[PDB]
Design a protein around this ligand. Structure first.
Ligand SMILES: [Zn+2]
Lengths: 175, 12
C-alpha cells in the first residue's frame, strides 16, 4: 500500500474503567486516529481539522475523557451516525480530500491499511474481501485517498456469511 | 460514563 500505519496501546482495563468513571485522562495524546473504548464496545476516532470524529452507534452521546475532565460533543448527529469532540491537544489533525480519487484505503484498529474501491457517496468495496471479525472495532476509522487525506470514516461492514465485501462510510462532506 | 482513549494509530 501507499500509506503505512502502526498502533501503540495506551491503557488497559483498570485504567479504562477508572477513566470512564472519572472522565479525566492525563495521558499524552498523539497520532491521527484515537483508539476508543467504552464499557461494552470498541471503535475508532479520526482527527480531522481539530475535531475527533466517530460513529454515534459507538459513542452515543458520551463525553470523551480529557486532560481537564470530560469533553462534551460539539457535534452530535444521530441520523448521520456521526459525532465529534474538539480534539485533545496532541492529536494529529488530518485534512479533507479534494482529489476525488476512487482508490481508497481503510485504516483498521490494528493499523492494517486495506484497499477500497469508491463505489458511491458512502460506499466503497473491499478489493480483497476480509472476514468481518477483522474489521471489528474499526468503526470511526479513516478512509484515505492515496495522498493521505480523509475521504470519510468507517461506519459499517457489508457482509454475507462472515466475509466483508463492502463498507458503508460517512463521506467527509458530512463532517 | 465517558468514552476513553485506550491507544492510538500513527499515520505514514
Ligand atoms: Zn484526495
Amino acid at each position: 500500500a501507499p500509506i503505512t500505519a502502526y498502533s501503540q496501546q495506551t491503557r488497559g482495563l483498570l485504567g479504562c474503567i477508572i477513566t470512564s468513571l472519572t472522565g479525566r485522562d492525563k495521558n499524552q495524546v498523539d497520532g491521527e486516529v484515537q483508539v476508543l473504548s467504552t464499557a461494552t464496545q470498541s471503535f475508532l476516532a479520526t482527527c480531522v481539522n481539530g475535531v475527533c470524529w466517530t460513529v454515534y452507534h459507538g459513542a452515543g452521546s458520551k463525553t470523551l475523557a480529557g486532560p481537564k475532565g470530560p469533553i462534551t460533543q460539539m457535534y452530535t448527529n444521530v441520523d448521520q451516525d456521526l459525532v465529534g469532540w474538539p480534539a485533545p491537544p496532541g492529536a494529529r489533525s488530518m485534512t479533507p480530500c479534494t482529489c476525488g480519487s476512487s482508490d481508497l484505503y481503510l485504516v483498521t484498529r490494528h493499523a492494517d491499511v486495506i484497499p477500497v474501491r469508491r463505489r458511491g457517496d458512502s460506499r466503497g468495496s473491499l478489493l480483497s474481501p476480509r472476514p468481518v471479525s477483522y474489521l471489528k472495532g474499526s468503526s470511526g476509522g479513516p478512509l484515505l485517498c492515496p495522498s493521505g487525506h480523509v475521504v470519510g470514516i468507517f461506519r459499517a461492514a457489508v457482509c454475507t456469511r462472515g466475509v466483508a465485501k463492502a463498507v458503508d462510510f460517512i463521506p467527509v462532506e458530512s463532517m | 460514563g465517558s468514552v476513553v482513549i485506550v491507544g492510538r494509530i500513527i499515520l505514514s
